[PDB]
Amino acid sequence: HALIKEDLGQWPVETGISLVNQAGVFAVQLANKLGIDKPFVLDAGSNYFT
Amino acid sequence: EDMAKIYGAVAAVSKNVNSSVTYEVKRGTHELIKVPTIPHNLVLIQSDNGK
């Protein structure tokens, strides 16, 4: 048996309060992890071999 | 960065919601003491000859 797992981390969620407000806080941290918070242009063209 | 500040401020407001209160109900309650003996207040008076 084998499987492929995508690990985006663990984010605690508190009940009794609005979920969307907590999502916004975690959204900026998620963008920081993926490196997409600041304006960027992808250069992966040279990442190849023959 | 300024978006994290705005999002943090909103979450602070949403977290200001109150859940419940807790208190003790003790008014009207008093402790009980225990009396060990029964007061009779009786004395027997008898003459010397017993008549």
Side-chain angles (χ1 to χ4, degrees), chain A:
Chain A
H1 300 298
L3 53 92
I4 292 171
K5 177 207 192 336
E6 178 189 22
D7 203 328
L8 272 174
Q10 266 274 349
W11 312 90
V13 174
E14 211 275 320
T15 321
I17 61 176
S18 71
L19 177 58
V20 201
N21 290 162
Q22 316 174 62
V25 188
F26 293 139
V28 188
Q29 299 174 47
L30 204 53
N32 263 300
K33 217 180 71 73
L34 289 154
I36 54 142
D37 43 342
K38 294 178 226 309
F40 75 100
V41 164
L42 192 64
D43 311 1
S46 34
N47 300 335
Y48 71 99
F49 69 88
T50 279

